[PDB]
């Protein structure tokens, strides 16, 4: 065997993937050369999930880097761990995306797609049996968003019986990078809700606020955000990477956490976010972790879940504490915070503890839950897209690419249907 194939797209996606690979290599004891210098026990048995067995014990990464700009591979290769990947997986074109989804999907998505399909095939048949495919990308550009949707559609068409999970980055009106970003978001959300199993919500502004108000960092940069997201995904996958007593996996979480296929978004989060000087003054216990995983200050959402009702909650722990404390905590939370979760469905919180602690930190736990807070983001996106499509500014580029305008019409129709569905399931009354 059970292995996971990892996919890469977008310069932000590429950098976060590189950061994650470095983090997992450091945690599992992998030198920048390629050999193994680890000293643990569970770092040799299930190590093959993300690596491949080769001669001399030199494990190799399993990740395909998809990009349209050659400047990304040179940047990511010069790093301390950029010499360990497979250069054959760095399939790059010659012309840039220009932050265009239609142009990137049409022009740079026809002649270059064949090579990445071939290599991901070869990787798939190189193994015995697989579970799913991981793609970390961003919607801020024509590289991650323009190509990730197409690749996910292709892999779903070829192998329907796989897990399609991703960690794309949601836009924000406050912190913007692309003028035509809402157009790209509206185009991408259709494919995300039509041909994607599950999707996690990633925001940069919320992470910036979190670090600025809790970590108290001098000069926080993208490296810190990459570290945080890498830790988030590592906590997500440790249910399979490091088995314990109550182990879980991606498909179980997807099935038990998604009431309806149309709604597959989530809200990630990690518990111990303290300042540098507060690391030596802290009390490691269950209720503190519960409060940090329940409050809105610690979560990485650029919204407020208190506006709606909690739908599905999965509290994944990674450590050696107990089992009673978790259930009593969730019980009393559901008893007291009765107006925060759907009353029709009791016991919306899932228990999951990993007996294998992470490297470098002793207690750690992440928050995977789907609360009612994305409705605001969806509604503001719909509003701004309706605006932008009213008088049709910044459309002649897309028109000259060849694709027509009815795609925007159907996309906004699906958008309105989705927001209506979300709002009328928000007020989940028991009866008439």
């Amino acid at each position: 065997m059970r292995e996971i194939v990892h996919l890469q797209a977008g310069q932000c996606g590429n950098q976060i993937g590189a950061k994650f690979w470095e983090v997992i290599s450091d945690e599992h004891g992998i030198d920048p050369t390629g050999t193994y210098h680890g000293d643990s026990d569970l770092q040799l048995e299930r190590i093959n999930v993300y690596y491949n067995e080769a001669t001399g014990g030199k494990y190799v990464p399993r990740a395909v880097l998809v990009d349209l700009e050659p400047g990304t591979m040179d940047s990511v290769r010069s790093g301390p761990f950029g010499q360990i990947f497979r250069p054959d997986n760095f399939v790059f074109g010659q012309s840039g995306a220009g932050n265009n989804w239609a142009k990137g999907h049409y022009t740079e998505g026809a002649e270059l797609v064949d090579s990445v399909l071939d290599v991901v095939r070869k990787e798939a048949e190189s193994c015995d049996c697989l579970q799913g495919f991981q793609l970390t990308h961003s919607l801020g550009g024509g590289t991650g968003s323009g190509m990730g949707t197409l690749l996910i559609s292709k892999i779903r068409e070829e192998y329907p019986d796989r897990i399609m999970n991703t960690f794309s980055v949601v836009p924000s009106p406050k912190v913007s990078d692309t003028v035509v970003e809402p157009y790209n978001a509206t185009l991408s959300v259709h494919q995300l809700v039509e041909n994607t199993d599950e999707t996690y919500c990633i925001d940069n502004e919320a992470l910036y606020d979190i670090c600025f108000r809790t970590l108290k960092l001098t000069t926080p940069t993208y490296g810190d955000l990459n570290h945080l997201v890498s830790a988030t995904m590592s906590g997500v996958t440790t249910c399979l990477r490091f088995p314990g007593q109550l182990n879980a996996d991606l498909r179980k979480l997807a099935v038990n956490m998604v009431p309806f296929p149309r709604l597959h978004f989530f809200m990630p989060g990690f518990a111990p976010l303290t300042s540098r000087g507060s690391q030596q003054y802290r009390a490691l216990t269950v209720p503190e972790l519960t409060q940090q995983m329940f409050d809105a200050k610690n979560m990485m959402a650029a919204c407020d879940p208190r506006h709606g009702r909690y739908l599905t909650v999965a509290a994944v722990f990674r450590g050696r504490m107990s089992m009673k404390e978790v259930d009593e905590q969730m019980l009393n939370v559901q008893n007291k915070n009765s107006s925060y979760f759907v009353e029709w469905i009791p016991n919306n919180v899932k228990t999951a503890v990993c007996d294998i602690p992470p490297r470098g930190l002793k207690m750690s736990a992440t928050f995977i839950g789907n609360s009612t807070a994305i409705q605001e983001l969806f509604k503001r996106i719909s509003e701004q897209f309706t605006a932008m499509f009213r008088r049709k500014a910044f459309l002649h580029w897309y028109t000259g690419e060849g694709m027509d305008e009815m795609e925007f019409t159907e996309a906004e129709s699906n958008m309105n249907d989705l927001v209506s569905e979300y709002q009328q399931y928000q007020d989940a009354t028991a009866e008439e």
Partner: protein, 116 residues
């Protein structure tokens, strides 16, 4: 030209709340180069406006006072603020110039301040 010659060493960056504030062309008539926008009957927007009007009419029936689309809007805005989630300590309502000048932005440790 008259300003540049009279003040001599003047640009139009020399802006200040003066009687010679050339924004005053628009102040004479804001309607000039402006088009009236009455509530139109666009069915694209009406698809959601029908639902919004149904909700507003239900609220009016439950309350008993005439509300417009705007009136409705500030009604639920005040209701949400009074609902408790007013979010006064995060970027959902705080002004942009309200994060730099906060002691949480004084990462420079209080040790040197103690020395001072």
């Amino acid at each position: 030209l008259k300003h540049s010659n009279k003040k001599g060493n003047a640009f139009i960056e020399h802006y200040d709340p003066k009687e010679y504030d050339p924004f005053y062309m628009s102040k004479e008539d804001p309607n000039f180069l402006k088009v009236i926008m009455p509530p139109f009957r666009d069915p694209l927007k009406k698809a959601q406006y029908d639902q919004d009007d149904e909700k507003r009419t239900l609220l009016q029936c439950e309350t008993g006072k005439i509300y417009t689309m705007k009136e409705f809007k500030e009604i639920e805005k005040a209701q949400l603020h009074s609902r408790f989630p007013s979010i006064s300590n995060s970027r959902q309502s705080m002004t942009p110039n309200g994060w730099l000048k906060v002691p949480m932005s004084y990462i420079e440790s209080e040790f040197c301040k103690k020395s001072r």
